[PDB]
């Protein structure tokens, strides 16, 4: 019976997984339309770093002690090289393996057993539905945070809050021995990761009309 | 199953294209080679977009991908 | 007999067909014709369609759903639901005196300039469709607003669906 | 004497609902930051000067494409009866673009392609010479 | 392999030859050679006289054409429009352009499995039959679609 | 994993790349059963069995 | 008679919200790139054009990847024009890589100058049938 | 579910629409559009002739309106009175204010589930029928309650 | 039992509203998620407005809250 509600939870979780994967596959074009990482890259095939915001910070550490600030920002993941832009499937395609092996250790033999089997399997089915929805909500919040961090770096760089990343490239001619050769040697290294600038005097204003 | 129906019948499987060629000189729409172009959008299995399943079997119900992430939906729950 | 594309902009001859197929019976055909030409039957059929009618005082208003009655995100007007439009013209034939004001509404998502232009495009299309049925041009005025006076909530989904609309008001004298 | 509201359609799905709820916030964030970018940086010129239209370039096209630029622009040029030319060596990182549009000009399609390309490449048209030239970026 | 897609979706060459036989015995021309496929229609089954408007019966033929062209797998579609000599050059060119525009828009609205649509209208500058007595009743006034089958 | 095709791969992100004179791509990449490519302007999912 | 609706239609409120959001974000990124892109003027771009000499209209095929000067000298010899050099060859060679099956010599030299960029350029004179490679300083 | 609330207390949509039908056949205007709702009442079945005194029989209809109004979950209710000009500006304005005030008083006295109520009266400054044969008997004299139903 | 009583019937559950929708466009008064607005004002359990029940079990029936305050109403009497 407890195993029965467990396998009902398994069936409900797999069923909602299949349903949500079909629904997500239905809207493939709009996801790539909205998550234009390939536009969001920078010119040296470099992922812009991740920033997080915060407004109206108050902490009561203990009695006789309050620390407040207006806003703050956090570097989450430092910028690095990238090769291909990431897609939404790296964050949203939840896994699915259908379990087709319910080994019924407790077969029904009475109608009361059939009825309690029905109601507890229903409870497991609903629990699997709730778990699948929670998993989806966690994933979409995560990828929303990623995109917001990228966009936050772009606009703080627009507002002159972070230095842009700096890359030195060194180019050398032919190389190698008489058996192995590479005809030119171009090496690029990023000598300056992006970071905040605490000198606020360089900041600039913003208006709308 | 008979792909070249209402035609000349099957000639062979052009595996350069991976497609059947019928006795009629038209390209059959069935495939006959694994190395051939499909158009599929759905997949199976778990620990996907990761290193696949970890080769070792964990004593508990947890499963883990090779990059360290844990797939709770493939894993057995309480 | 009858043409699907708005009957090629001609007033219809339908009751003659009804009494002909009733004879195929003149009195029963006549009473069926007057019952189908009754105003209350037309309003009941309009509310059987997805169109809302409001009368209170001397002012009457009609509410049309933009997504269900147009091609999406464009001033192209969907013509699958043409019987509703034909019955709308039949209803608006009854009030040949007062001027008609028409206005457009959309939701709060996107550029406000874009919302204004989309509502204005919908207003222009409804304006010329109402003009082309025979009513004189100086009896009409159209305006398209964005999300100025929403009668619903944007954050809730069904209310966000209900917000975007076409409003038609007219007086009597 | 029944009562109903006007909008009624096929039923929805909760995942789509949550997706739209996130997408609204993302969209308005992008809108306001496009506004602040446009305010703090003034434009200087227009790419329509570099890419002018000409006759027989006004064929209509509706296009969905999500690949590299090469075969797409090549089929565009062979529709245009023009000369396809490539300038600069091909980059090691592949250049990818995405287009979902409906019934636009060929010249506007070209300008959209170059606008989505940005700093990686550029397009020039010599209509007197009937040559469509692309060119890669001189960095690295 | 049974889990793998055995054939393409809705692929039946019996249905293919059925619909092409129906179209050829109906009278709309459909020709196939190599990978290149051409379908030609006369404007008398599509419009009225010198008018870029659609009659309501034509959507049946549009649905049949869409059902035929969705059967294969392809990349690019090219449609073209040809007119009689009626008044000028400008009017006929614009009429051909508009007809190509509206048929392309309806095709994209329907479930076309193609990625590129090209429209081109010409007018009365590439005739076929030198016998030019009729107006839109002439067989030369026409609309053609073309593609190459991809693999 | 080492892979050889004449398409362009997208999904996992590779470490090493190589291109022929004729237009054949070969890559060295982290192991995974899933690939994404753009075949001829169409996005395509590619399945690997055997890991 | 019959007229089926668009099959892949957003008939749902969530779908239409998603679609208009996609429209908004596409438009926003488009105007972002439009206002941030830097474009050279076509009346002031410093690239070499076609000189329309008759002997430079011939066709060939070259798959070369090496130094510049010997390639230009052999190109001039194939064009039966004289060859000149101004400046000094630096220690690191200027490197070019052209692979083509059918092309003419004028646009070959045009893409040669384009790959050259800053450190070197070329001039071609049809009054006295000469080509010249110019180094920078 | 055995402890979590399956429904809001006293919720029955069948009761809602049956009393909606009963109210509209009683002749009290009920208006539903969007999330906004209006209940409009003629003053002749409520008050005396240009007098701020409730008739005794009106309390049954007031109980009916309270029983309907307690069904929804509201935040704020707005009531406004309108009349016809009889003496001046000031007497008509004050009469509308007093009528709206006593209606709001009895409505708060009953257990309505609102946090905010606003009462207002505008005399005769918003005519809704230019046909003005009668005075208090004319249907332009009215009282309106209004709200917006949320969540 | 009856949500759209004397109405059309259920269309879907808006989880932004936590509520169903009837076939007529009115917002249906029926809960469908646990994340709705229930104005529950009566409660259940022990050690409320405190640290909750301490996880230990005792030989005695005396049960304390996690912030250290005892509870004779939850602890059994003699």
């Amino acid at each position: 019976k407890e195993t029965a509600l467990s396998v009902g939870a398994q069936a409900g979780l797999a069923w909602r997984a299949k349903i949500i994967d079909e629904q997500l596959n239905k809207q493939a074009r709009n996801l790539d339309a909205i998550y234009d990482f390939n536009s969001l890259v920078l010119e040296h095939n470099i992922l812009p770093p991740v920033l997080l915001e915060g407004r109206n910070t108050l902490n009561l550490a203990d009695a006789q002690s309050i620390r407040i600030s207006d806003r703050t920002y956090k570097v989450a993941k430092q910028a690095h090289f990238i090769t291909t832009p990431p897609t939404w499937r790296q964050y949203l395609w939840m896994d699915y393996v259908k379990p087709e092996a319910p080994n019924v250790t407790l077969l029904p033999k009475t109608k009361a057993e059939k009825e309690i089997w029905c109601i507890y399997t229903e409870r497991g089915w609903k629990n699997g539905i709730d778990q699948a929805n929670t998993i989806l909500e966690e994933n979409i919040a995560r990828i929303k945070e990623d995109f917001g961090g990228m966009i936050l770096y772009r606009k703080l760089l627009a507002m002159n809050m972070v230095s842009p990343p700096y890359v030195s490239h060194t180019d050398l001619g032919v190389t190698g021995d008489g058996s192995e050769i590479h005809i030119d040697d171009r090496v690029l290294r990023i000598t300056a990761l992006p970071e905040l600038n605490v000198n606020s005097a360089e900041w600039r204003a913003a208006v709308a009309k | 199953d008979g792909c070249c129906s209402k035609m000349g019948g099957i000639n062979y499987c052009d595996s350069s294209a991976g497609r059947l060629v019928c006795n009629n000189g038209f390209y059959s729409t069935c495939y006959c080679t694994r190395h051939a172009v499909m158009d599929l959008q759905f997949l199976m299995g778990c620990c996907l977009w990761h290193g696949g399943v970890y080769p070792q079997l964990n004593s508990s119900g947890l499963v883990v991908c090779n990059d360290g992430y844990v797939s709770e939906e493939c894993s057995l729950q309480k | 007999c009858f043409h699907p594309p708005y009957n090629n902009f001609q007033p219809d001859r339908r009751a003659v067909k009804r009494v002909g197929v009733d004879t195929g019976g003149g009195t029963v055909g006549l009473v069926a014709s007057i019952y189908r030409d009754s105003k209350r039957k037309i309003i009941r059929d309009l509310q059987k369609q997805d169109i809302q009618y409001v009368e209170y005082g001397d002012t009457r208003t009609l509410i049309i759903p933009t997504d269900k009655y147009f091609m999406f995100s464009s001033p192209r007007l969907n013509e699958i639901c043409y019987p509703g439009l034909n019955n709308v013209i039949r209803l608006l034939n009854f009030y040949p005196q007062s001027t008609i004001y028409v206005a457009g509404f959309t939701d709060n998502v996107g550029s406000r300039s874009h919302k204004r232009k989309l509502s204005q495009a919908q207003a222009e299309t409804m304006m010329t469709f109402l003009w082309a049925n025979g009513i004189a041009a100086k009896r009409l005025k159209a305006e398209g607003y964005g999300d100025k006076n929403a009668i619903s909530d944007n954050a809730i989904i069904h209310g966000s669906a209900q917000n975007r609309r076409i409003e038609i008001q007219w007086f009597t004298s | 004497m029944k009562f109903k509201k006007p909008p009624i359609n096929n039923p929805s799905d909760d995942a789509t609902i949550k997706l739209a709820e996130a997408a609204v916030s993302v969209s308005d964030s992008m809108l306001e930051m496009a506004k602040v970018e446009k305010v703090i940086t003034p434009p200087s010129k227009d790419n329509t000067l570099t890419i002018p239209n000409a006759y027989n370039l006004q064929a209509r096209a509706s296009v969905d494409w999500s690949g590299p630029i090469e075969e797409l622009t090549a089929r565009i040029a062979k529709a245009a009866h023009f000369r396809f030319r490539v300038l600069g060596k091909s980059p090691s990182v592949p250049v990818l673009i995405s287009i979902s549009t409906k019934d636009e000009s060929l010249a506007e399609i070209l300008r959209d392609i170059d606008y989505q390309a940005g700093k990686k490449a550029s397009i020039h048209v010599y209509p007197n010479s009937q040559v469509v030239e692309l060119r890669y970026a001189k960095i690295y | 392999v049974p889990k793998l897609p055995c054939r393409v979706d809705g692929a039946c060459d019996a249905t293919i030859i059925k619909m092409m036989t129906d179209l050829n015995k109906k009278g709309i021309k459909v020709a196939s050679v190599g990978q290149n496929y051409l379908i030609s229609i006369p404007a008398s089954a599509l419009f009225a006289d010198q008018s870029p408007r659609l009659n309501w019966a034509s959507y049946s033929l549009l649905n049949e054409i869409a059902a035929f062209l969705k059967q294969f797998r392809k990349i690019a579609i090219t449609v073209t429009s040809y007119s009689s000599k009626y008044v000028s050059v400008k009017r006929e060119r614009a009429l051909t352009l508009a007809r190509s525009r509206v048929v392309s828009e309806y095709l994209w609205s329907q479930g076309v499995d193609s990625r590129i649509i090209f429209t081109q209208g010409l007018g009365s500058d590439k005739p076929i039959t030198s016998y030019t007595l009729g107006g839109d009743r002439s067989p030369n006034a026409r609309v053609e679609i073309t593609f190459r089958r991809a693999v | 994993m080492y892979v050889r095709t004449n398409l362009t791969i997208l999904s996992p992100g590779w470490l090493a790349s190589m291109t022929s004179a004729d237009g054949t791509h070969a890559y060295e990449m982290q192991k995974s059963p899933v690939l994404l490519v753009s075949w001829h302007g169409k996005v395509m999912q590619l399945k690997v069995e055997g890991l």
Side-chain angles (χ1 to χ4, degrees), chain E residues 15-16 18-20 22-23 26 28 39 41 57-71 106-107 110 145:
Chain E
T15 62
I16 294 178
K18 265 178 59 54
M19 59 190 166
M20 77 173 48
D22 277 19
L23 286 189
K26 234 297 183 58
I28 156 187
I39 285 97
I41 7 261
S58 51
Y59 285 100
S60 62
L61 295 326
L62 287 182
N63 289 11
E64 297 321 293
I65 269 301
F68 177 75
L69 66 95
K70 74 162 54 56
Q71 190 42 246
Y106 182 72
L107 253 304
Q110 303 323 291
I145 86 183

XYZ file of all heavy atoms in Angstrom, chain E residues 15-16 18-20 22-23 26 28 39 41 57-71 106-107 110 145:
243
model
N -0.227 7.545 -51.586
C -0.940 8.812 -51.484
C -0.301 9.879 -52.355
O -1.014 10.732 -52.901
C -0.985 9.294 -50.036
O 0.348 9.513 -49.562
C -1.677 8.275 -49.157
N 1.026 9.825 -52.507
C 1.736 10.792 -53.345
C 1.293 10.679 -54.796
O 0.905 11.673 -55.432
C 3.253 10.586 -53.216
C 3.713 10.907 -51.804
C 3.995 11.425 -54.236
C 5.183 10.673 -51.600
N -1.353 9.215 -55.821
C -2.789 9.457 -55.866
C -3.091 10.935 -56.044
O -3.857 11.319 -56.936
C -3.443 8.939 -54.589
C -4.005 7.543 -54.706
C -4.594 7.072 -53.390
C -5.703 7.994 -52.923
N -6.737 8.172 -53.975
N -2.465 11.782 -55.229
C -2.780 13.199 -55.322
C -2.181 13.825 -56.573
O -2.805 14.716 -57.167
C -2.340 13.943 -54.062
C -0.875 13.871 -53.703
S -0.660 14.555 -52.048
C 0.996 14.021 -51.633
N -1.020 13.344 -57.032
C -0.495 13.921 -58.263
C -1.289 13.455 -59.479
O -1.469 14.230 -60.428
C 0.999 13.627 -58.409
C 1.386 12.238 -58.846
S 3.152 12.136 -59.171
C 3.794 12.914 -57.693
N -4.544 12.828 -59.359
C -5.761 13.627 -59.278
C -5.534 15.035 -59.803
O -6.382 15.572 -60.520
C -6.274 13.670 -57.841
C -7.105 12.459 -57.487
O -6.990 11.434 -58.189
O -7.885 12.538 -56.517
N -4.382 15.632 -59.489
C -4.110 16.982 -59.974
C -3.889 17.010 -61.482
O -4.354 17.932 -62.165
C -2.909 17.574 -59.244
C -3.161 17.999 -57.796
C -1.978 18.776 -57.252
C -4.427 18.824 -57.687
N -7.116 16.498 -63.107
C -7.925 17.687 -62.897
C -7.559 18.772 -63.894
O -8.440 19.450 -64.433
C -7.747 18.183 -61.467
C -9.043 18.345 -60.715
C -9.918 19.392 -61.367
C -11.185 19.604 -60.572
N -10.883 20.020 -59.177
N -4.596 21.020 -63.473
C -3.466 21.786 -62.966
C -2.192 21.004 -63.239
O -2.109 19.805 -62.945
C -3.653 22.077 -61.471
C -2.311 22.335 -60.786
C -4.395 20.934 -60.801
C -2.410 22.472 -59.290
N 4.936 23.045 -60.386
C 3.481 22.971 -60.435
C 2.949 24.297 -60.962
O 3.254 25.357 -60.408
C 2.872 22.632 -59.064
C 3.070 21.152 -58.740
C 1.399 22.928 -59.036
C 4.259 20.869 -57.873
N -0.480 26.583 -62.356
C -1.928 26.757 -62.281
C -2.365 27.927 -63.150
O -1.663 28.952 -63.221
C -2.413 26.981 -60.839
C -1.237 27.152 -59.863
C -3.410 25.899 -60.444
C -0.852 25.914 -59.081
N -14.033 29.277 -53.369
C -13.855 27.883 -53.747
C -12.389 27.516 -53.925
O -12.051 26.328 -53.884
C -14.628 27.585 -55.030
N -11.514 28.507 -54.098
C -10.116 28.244 -54.416
C -9.339 27.676 -53.239
O -8.258 27.107 -53.437
C -9.450 29.527 -54.902
O -9.678 30.584 -53.989
N -9.864 27.808 -52.024
C -9.143 27.308 -50.867
C -9.118 25.792 -50.804
O -8.218 25.237 -50.175
C -9.745 27.886 -49.599
C -9.365 29.324 -49.408
C -10.244 30.343 -49.735
C -8.116 29.665 -48.912
C -9.892 31.663 -49.560
C -7.756 30.980 -48.732
C -8.647 31.974 -49.059
O -8.294 33.287 -48.884
N -10.057 25.117 -51.467
C -9.974 23.668 -51.602
C -8.736 23.265 -52.393
O -7.976 22.378 -51.979
C -11.232 23.147 -52.284
O -11.328 23.689 -53.589
N -8.500 23.941 -53.518
C -7.318 23.667 -54.328
C -6.048 24.080 -53.602
O -5.009 23.423 -53.733
C -7.413 24.391 -55.670
C -8.508 24.002 -56.667
C -8.813 22.510 -56.596
C -9.769 24.840 -56.485
N -6.122 25.167 -52.830
C -4.988 25.581 -52.011
C -4.651 24.535 -50.961
O -3.474 24.256 -50.713
C -5.286 26.915 -51.343
C -5.251 28.117 -52.273
C -5.516 29.373 -51.484
C -3.914 28.202 -52.970
N -5.673 23.943 -50.342
C -5.449 22.896 -49.354
C -4.861 21.647 -49.990
O -3.986 21.005 -49.401
C -6.754 22.566 -48.638
C -7.193 23.666 -47.709
O -6.642 24.764 -47.734
N -8.186 23.382 -46.881
N -5.326 21.293 -51.192
C -4.749 20.147 -51.895
C -3.292 20.393 -52.258
O -2.448 19.500 -52.105
C -5.558 19.829 -53.148
C -6.976 19.413 -52.861
C -7.072 18.533 -51.641
O -6.566 17.393 -51.691
O -7.640 18.985 -50.628
N -2.982 21.607 -52.713
C -1.613 21.960 -53.062
C -0.721 21.937 -51.828
O 0.402 21.418 -51.872
C -1.607 23.324 -53.778
C -1.737 23.113 -55.281
C -0.356 24.129 -53.497
C -0.630 22.257 -55.858
N -1.224 22.452 -50.704
C -0.461 22.444 -49.463
C -0.238 21.028 -48.956
O 0.849 20.708 -48.463
C -1.174 23.281 -48.407
N -1.251 20.168 -49.082
C -1.106 18.776 -48.679
C -0.102 18.044 -49.550
O 0.616 17.164 -49.063
C -2.460 18.076 -48.731
N -0.037 18.392 -50.834
C 0.979 17.794 -51.691
C 2.371 18.272 -51.311
O 3.291 17.463 -51.154
C 0.692 18.105 -53.156
C 1.740 17.582 -54.089
C 1.799 16.231 -54.388
C 2.674 18.433 -54.663
C 2.764 15.733 -55.240
C 3.647 17.942 -55.514
C 3.689 16.590 -55.804
N 2.550 19.584 -51.159
C 3.894 20.108 -50.954
C 4.406 19.876 -49.545
O 5.619 19.930 -49.329
C 3.956 21.599 -51.287
C 3.199 22.646 -50.469
C 4.059 23.291 -49.385
C 2.693 23.713 -51.405
N 3.525 19.620 -48.583
C 4.000 19.294 -47.250
C 4.477 17.858 -47.139
O 5.052 17.493 -46.110
C 2.903 19.530 -46.216
C 1.809 18.475 -46.238
C 0.988 18.491 -44.958
C 0.441 19.876 -44.661
N -0.366 20.410 -45.789
N 4.245 17.041 -48.165
C 4.571 15.628 -48.074
C 6.075 15.397 -48.103
O 6.579 14.464 -47.469
C 3.873 14.873 -49.198
C 3.950 13.379 -49.072
C 3.729 12.911 -47.658
O 4.635 12.377 -47.026
N 2.519 13.107 -47.149
N -0.588 32.842 -47.545
C -1.477 31.752 -47.156
C -0.717 30.446 -47.007
O -1.031 29.640 -46.121
C -2.607 31.574 -48.161
C -3.559 30.479 -47.742
C -4.426 30.667 -46.680
C -3.579 29.254 -48.393
C -5.296 29.676 -46.284
C -4.446 28.254 -47.999
C -5.301 28.474 -46.943
O -6.169 27.491 -46.538
N 0.292 30.226 -47.851
C 1.060 28.993 -47.745
C 1.874 28.947 -46.460
O 1.916 27.909 -45.791
C 1.961 28.829 -48.962
C 1.456 27.736 -49.898
C 1.317 26.417 -49.160
C 0.130 28.137 -50.507
N -0.405 28.190 -43.641
C -0.646 26.769 -43.511
C 0.648 26.056 -43.143
O 1.732 26.644 -43.124
C -1.239 26.203 -44.795
C -2.529 26.879 -45.223
C -3.405 27.253 -44.049
O -3.952 26.392 -43.367
N -3.524 28.550 -43.796
N 4.868 27.279 -59.088
C 5.686 26.995 -57.919
C 6.754 25.996 -58.337
O 6.580 25.230 -59.293
C 4.850 26.468 -56.726
C 4.644 24.957 -56.804
C 3.495 27.139 -56.689
C 3.785 24.389 -55.713
